[PDB]
Amino acid sequence: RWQRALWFAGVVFCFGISAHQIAMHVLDYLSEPVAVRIDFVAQNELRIPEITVCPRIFQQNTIFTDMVEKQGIDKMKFLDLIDRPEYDIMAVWNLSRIFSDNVSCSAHEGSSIISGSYVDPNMSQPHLVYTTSGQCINIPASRPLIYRGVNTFVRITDSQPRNLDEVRPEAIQIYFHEHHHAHLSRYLTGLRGYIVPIANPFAFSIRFTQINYANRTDSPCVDSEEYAACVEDFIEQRIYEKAQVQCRLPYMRPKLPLCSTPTDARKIFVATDDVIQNFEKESSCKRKCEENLYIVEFMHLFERSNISIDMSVYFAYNYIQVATEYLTYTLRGLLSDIGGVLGLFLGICILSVIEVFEVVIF
Amino acid sequence: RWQRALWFAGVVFCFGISAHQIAMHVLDYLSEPVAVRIDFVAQNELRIPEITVCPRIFQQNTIFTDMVEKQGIDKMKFLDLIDRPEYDIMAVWNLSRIFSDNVSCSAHEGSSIISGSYVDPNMSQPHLVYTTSGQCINIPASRPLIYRGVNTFVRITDSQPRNLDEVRPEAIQIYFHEHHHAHLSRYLTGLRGYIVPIANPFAFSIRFTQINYANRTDSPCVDSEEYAACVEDFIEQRIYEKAQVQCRLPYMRPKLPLCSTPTDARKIFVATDDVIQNFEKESSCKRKCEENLYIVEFMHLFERSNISIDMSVYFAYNYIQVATEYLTYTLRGLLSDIGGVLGLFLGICILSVIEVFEVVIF
Amino acid sequence: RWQRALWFAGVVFCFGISAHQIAMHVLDYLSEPVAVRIDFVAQNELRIPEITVCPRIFQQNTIFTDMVEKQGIDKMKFLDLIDRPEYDIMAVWNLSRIFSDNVSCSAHEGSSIISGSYVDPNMSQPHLVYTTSGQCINIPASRPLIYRGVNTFVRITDSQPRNLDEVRPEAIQIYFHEHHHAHLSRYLTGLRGYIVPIANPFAFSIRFTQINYANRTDSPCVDSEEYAACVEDFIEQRIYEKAQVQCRLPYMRPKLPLCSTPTDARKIFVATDDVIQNFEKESSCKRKCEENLYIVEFMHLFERSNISIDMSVYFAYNYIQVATEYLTYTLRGLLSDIGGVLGLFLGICILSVIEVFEVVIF
Incomplete structure (x- = not known):
């Protein structure tokens, strides 16, 4: 039934x-x-970015364009200077040097009502680096700043002889990037770097956002060290295969000999221009699990010193916005x-x- | 048992x-x-607000009050100028004009270490609009800016003949609102717009936040187009109902004829003043599903041009904080x-x- | 089987x-x-911080050390001034006064195209307070500002006779802290307060984040009133215990008699310096489950008045970022x-x- x-x-x-x-x-x-948990963690000690300070890109470089035009070359063919015997690529890119060897990087953790300021002139002193925009300075940021009060900042101070013996530069370009990302300093300082004048030194103000991701099979992440190496290796490999030449430029790792003719140098430089525009979306490197964003606001400075290039970077906000992606x-x-x-x-x-x-x- | x-x-x-x-x-x-997921999305191209640039409100309008006072009227009865035969409401509100027809809107996406800047002087050129603050300018923001570098900004530049033949204005008022909200530009520019001088041209810095809501039966949301129409219709309907008159003012859609006597014009203007204060809380229009907030910080400009009214709007931060509300x-x-x-x-x-x-x- | x-x-x-x-x-x-829900609430009225305005710490105080040096003591022993019969601790800390009795605190909620600005010169007028950095001013913030437009600010204005009869001060220190935290104003203004000049009056810009926590057995919270009292009691108790003396300084509640000799005053002052550095981490007081963060950006002021000490605190952003921790x-x-x-x-x-x-x- x-x-x-x-x-x-x-x-x-x-x-x-x-x-x-x-x-x-x-x-x-x-x-x-996976869900996301947002919190605001108050830090007793802050982790500074690596601060790469370049001059303006070659065409926008005052002091470099001035001395390359006197040779009799246009505002675009600055690489044609290589053809001359005495001038080589390294010599060409040493002319863009804006900072002298006197650059200092002090760390002021203003506190101690009883003892005054907390100057510390020996915090990871600057070192040379070669970027697409010339010969730049880098701040390794060896140790984290101890936050006690809003007057916590890092002051990059260069006191070169600003006189009439030479034409002085007009501005610099400071980029605050991840702690150990060497590709962000030698390739992307001219793009992501904030342009700031040196005649009137004002300050930046960095606020910290942190995004911790979950290592998922469908969307895996890597540590901050593997990602940097992956992305760099990808960038140089892509530039080398696009330029179809076997020479490099100062901002490239010493894998191949330096370019010695204007044609190859320009080929590599244009290949770098093309690669850097899309090295993120057109790259297989997995995102790093922890991503630090440095919200850079501006800040007035009331007391302007007589130093040549003074640049303070304030960290008056000690509340890191942490977004943890938990499973x-x-x-x-x-x-x-x-x-x-x-x-x-x-x-x-x-x-x-x-x-x-x-x-x-x- | x-x-x-x-x-x-x-x-x-x-x-x-x-x-x-x-x-x-x-x-x-x-x-x-419903839960909320917070993330920081890096954009290869940015979605610019619509930027409505008014003069300061009639009473605070330098160039308008100076010209209405010579007639012999007080600092509040600027609508009484209508009573005179030659002066009508449209003529009265055309006298508040601050921007000439030479206004242009360039878009600079700083990039190209090889080829320099990326000036683009034909991005959605400004057009006239009648706001409660007078005769203002609007920047429809037709296309999204392609973000490559922190030097990504939109520069509104007017080069009218700043001479002694006429008294020059002191400041303008820029409001960054969502795209197709014709009520925000035409009613709320004078209240929500940041006042900025034109003698010393500086720049803003817009950081984007996005909040996507979930269409819930107990908390419904509409698309960005329905909400704007609903709110605009409510605002004009409420103004007409409260004023109890059958005319309008230049900042109202051409549904009724323009007011031609000071009494009716003042009635409508006071009705608008009372409506705009509580238009959002005293309105039934359902919220929009996707709401964009434009955090407007200030920025220092090192090179000040000789242009009359120059003003850049920087978009150096391409990390949009997206809050998605998911069921x-x-x-x-x-x-x-x-x-x-x-x-x-x-x-x-x-x-x-x-x-x-x-x-x-x- | x-x-x-x-x-x-x-x-x-x-x-x-x-x-x-x-x-x-x-x-x-x-x-x-417990999970976290993030939203951006648009407030029709804003809840202003308590704004404590101090002079710079005794050592950095221009107008105080200038006259202390006239007596003949070094830049560290300003407490040695107590030893002289005419000068006591209260007299010493009254010499650091920078604000006169003419200080006023106006509240401008810019709106009303029909009626102009909304000046309100009687919003919780400032009152005296004693801080580790001297004799300071406090703004209780009795009522919340009504937000209608970006021109919503609180203007602290002092018009003392800035002349050559006396040397004028160089800068002040404004700390934006929670309402009923008397320990933040009397101890942490010199550390957490932003230093700003008074010769060139510019404005701050406060943005509001709120973090509501859940009262959990393993992570309990207390209301904003209990936390302040707990932390203040802890701070004074620890200062008294570490100094190993039975006197106090003007910035301490009247539990013990004032110190009358340089040795005891210096001991208490050093104990305060040591306690304030680690008062938050090295304390048992349970957190408050409503924590308000005041992101303080800077703002350009176009019109500089002739008033002696003028400073505006803009609240142009009415979108409070609320993070509610729900169970x-x-x-x-x-x-x-x-x-x-x-x-x-x-x-x-x-x-x-x-x-x-x-x-x-x-």
């Missing part, structure tokens, strides 16, 4: 639906759903969900399965 | 409590609980929760219900 | 695992997990999870336990 059909249809439908929701739950657990839907949740799925419709437990197996085996 | 009472009490309590949690779960599932408690979760509630206490499945029905039908 | 061993092993394993997940679920429910995993969820765990493997309901009890009782 209709009883057989009714019961069979009910059992088949219940089994099918149980399979459907158990499969959906297992599938989404494998998808590793929800643990294994216990999946098991409970499966039990609920097969507890509403059906009613077979993990205990009756042993009964079925014993019946089968007798 | 006590067995009957004990068993009946247990069964009734279990059934009632099962109903209680099943009802609670279905009820909060219907409430559609938790999917139907699968509701079914699993119901099964769990029905499996801890009770023990009837959706498989025993078919047995009950078959017994009932025999 | 193997049937008995198989069945016993299956039953024991199922019971043990059921106990394991039930224990894990009950334990994590007791752990009381997930309610009791219903725990019961559903337990039922799911108990319905997957096992299959004994809360209804079968009553049967077991009735069998036991017969």
